[PDB]
Ligand SMILES: Cc1ccn(-c2nc(NC3CCC(F)(F)CC3)cc(N3CCOCC3)n2)n1
């Protein structure tokens with residue numbers, strides 16, 4: 001009984017997906033912004049400065065990998081949602097429409 | 109008075125083995141308050157066990173992207189055995205024919221050994237082919253239908269229109 | 271660069287094999303020493319030192335091998351990610367795990383002779399008991415934590431998770447070959463073997479551990495009996511009960527709790 | 543390159559070929575992917591082999607295969623990671639980015655910069671001379 | 687209105703529009719709803735977009751989008767519920783109900799009234815003059 | 831053949847021929863397969879009929895399948911198994927194998943022979959005069 005009652009209904013999933021997507025869209029942008037910032041700042045500190053301070057360059061090269069990993073993880077989480085979101089589409093709803101269209105095409 | 113159930117660690121152990129439904133050990137409450145608390149713990153544990161049973165069956169299943177690689181690995185591993193088995197059966201057939209026809213004197217121990225290995229070769233080939241069929245017909249069942257149905261609907265609509 | 275990568279892989283694998291060989295020897299010698307000390311010879315004999323110096327030497331060599339292995343893997347990281355300085359690879363998580371490995375692998379019963387006072391409350395009768403114990407009992411049992419090297423050796427020696435083409439296809443599909451993936455794969459290829467090996471191994475290990483703990487405060491030979499411990503572990507794993515056998519020490523109760531939790535997990539898995 | 547790796551590639555390189563003709567086919571790949579449980583579209587199947595080619599014939603062979611297998615086996619390549627994180631903020635998809643949303647995101651969206659750094663970044667990468675910033679040219683220039 | 691609400695509404699309006707043009711398309715809505723897991727029909731999408739609109743064409747913008755957000759946050763204890771209450775007993779979709787149907791329903795179906803109240807209600811609702819009661823006018827008369 | 835054996839297969843045949851015709855067609859078999867949960871294609875049905883075809887006719891009667899029976903209960907057949915063993919290494923499907931491939935597989939795959947045995951086998955198999963060996967006749971020669 002508990003396994004029967006655990007799951008949500010259709011109308012609840014239809015809004016759960018909306019909330020999840022709305023949350024994920026923000027993180028997929030924060031991660032990209034951090035990646036771009038780290039790349040630019042590395043290039044500036046390694047080329048434009050007359051002298052070179054290696055501790056700062058090393059710290060920025062360390063943060064670059066963190067940014068890349070976070071972006072990749074968030075994109076994977078975003079991909080996982082669509083696979084279970086598109087499995088809720090019924091078949092008997094469009095089956096009748098396709099059958100009627102095929103019948104009309106055959107008749108005329 | 110003897111410091112059994114008034115011991116903090118004794119109460120911890122009692123609650124742990126009452127939640128999990130193992131028993132009571134030497135530790136029984138002397139008051140109805142203890143028995144009430146133990147009953148509450150037992151009911152909560154009985155519910156939580158079923159919830160964990162439901163959870164594990166969902167958390168121990170591969171996602172689609174992992175299936176797409178699992179199938180590739182399994183197929184590229186089975187293709188080798190389906191060839192080793194055939195090599196062995198062909199070898200045994202050739203040796204049987206050679207030792208039974210192209211010789212002056214017939215030695216029967218060798219012929220019997222080769223006829224014995226022939227059947228094992230046949231059985232191994234059959235088993236490997238069965239595993240390959242099982243993999244194929246268990247793998248070709250996770251293809252979605254919404255995209256293909258939409259494509260067919262659009263094609264039917266275009267054909268009806270024109 | 272392919273040759274350099276191949277050489278690094280081979281060296282890392284060989285170091286892992288040597289580390290496992292040098293850990294199992296120490297565990298076995300500890301088992302023999304604990305068995306024979308309660309009997310033939312006491313702690314003041316020359317055999318005590320003669321058999322603990324072996325343990326200490328094995329520990330030193332094991333620490334050396336682990337450090338060399340970690341240096342090799344840092345070199346491999348530098349090759350893979352395209353870096354020129356090794357300080358880039360040193361984050362907080364890496365340092366924490368290296369220190370944890372060193373600390374876990376650097377425990378053993380040191381040579382010497384020290385004593386300790388142990389008070390326990392007897393079961394089913396609530397009568398106190400006082401003895402004098404050995405400090406080696408607190409230092410010897412934590413040595414079973416070394417068993418995590420078997421996982422590393424098996425994962426590194428597996429041909430199914432090593433082919434270059436499979437790694438390339440997985441990279442194209444944007445998935446990672448971590449330990450969760452391999453565990454999920456073996457839980458589908460063959461779950462019976464996985465659930466059987468772990469059960470038997472934990473069975474003997476915990477049955478010996480309870481006896482080694484509880485032989486001190488036991489006089490009537492109940493929980494210091496090997497078969498009694500085996501029966502106790504069997505009926506605690508399956509949640510039938512305790513019979514008339516309860517540990518007299520908190521070590522026994524901890525071991526029994528671990529057994530019970532593992533048993534509930536295994537029962538759910540077998541249900542699936 | 544060790545001979546063992548070459549043989550390991552040639553095995554499962556002989557895959558995707560149901561006739562053993564020593565060449566690739568846009569239908570053999572479809573059959574293989576159907577066998578593994580997928581079913582991509584014709585355009586996607588074309589793009590899969592289009593993204594790695596150097597002759598324009600629409601057919602690759604052992605050299606290109608080994609070329610792609612050389613990569614796709616290491617860790618972070620530090621090039622695709624910056625290839626993305628632009629398309630996230632790139633809407634139309636032609637390959638140009640306006641010079642105002644860049645300032646907005648760099649000043650607002652997470653671990654924000656300051657005005658001096660953003661102004662310096664905009665002053666740099668001014669090859670185009672217009673508001674439309676070419677991010678592809680900014681790559682291979684800031685990371686050459 | 688606190689600027690946080692406006693910012694949230696603008697962030698939500700950024701959805702349904704994967705073009706950056708600031709204009710809701712009857713195909714963009716279909717794509718979004720397909721992403722969420724639904725496949726409405728073209729007529730259903732047309733009705734959904736035509737339920738609220740200001741200009742003649744099927745175009746909704748942020749000024750045309752923030753109108754009903756305020757209404758949908760409250761509890762619709764208004765004439766909206768009476769609309770479905772009337773429509774339950776309304777067989778055809780024209781919107782007219784016969785008087786005898788009201789008599790029978792009010793006098794028989796649940797916490798029944800007394801015939802005096804029903805006669806008074808019919809006399810007060812004698813706006814049609816024929817017997818084909820228009821419930822919209824009655825709704826406006828009752829709720830004002 | 832015992833009386834019980836003769837009376838056997840009669841219920842199965844009646845199940846196949848649910849018309850009283852006395853002969854088995856290519857449509858009743860399709861109906862039976864659909865009943866049991868399978869939906870084979872027309873080519874597969876034709877091939878299944880052909881594999882038990884009496885001489886040339888596209889129909890099966892009661893004397894036809896008695897020949898097939900009492901053969902599908904003999905376990906090892908020692909000919910069909912060698913047939914699939916040859917077909918595994920046969921790529922195109924015409925029914926011919928190159929000699930070099932045979933040498934390679936016999937000297938490399940599985941339990942391996944030595945060059946003397948392989949050379950002797952090829953010399954004894956030189957009943958072709960060319961690279962193609964025509965294993966079909968070789969099967970008859972080997973199995974005697
Ligand atoms: C399971 C499997 C087997 C192959 N897979 C696969 N192949 C891809 N392309 C290659 C191009 C060179 C080639 F000769 F090898 C032919 C195929 C691309 C690709 N991708 C990238 C796009 O998102 C989906 C995964 N997957 N996946």
Ligand SMILES: Cc1ccn(-c2nc(NC3CCC(F)(F)CC3)cc(N3CCOCC3)n2)n1
Pocket residue numbers: 014015018702722734735746751
């Ligand atoms: C999950 C999801 C996302 C959107 N959903 C949704 N949108 C509706 N219309 C909107 C009104 C505001 C607008 F500006 F966005 C134009 C389109 C109507 C609607 N309904 C009412 C009819 O019964 C089905 C649910 N659902 N549902």
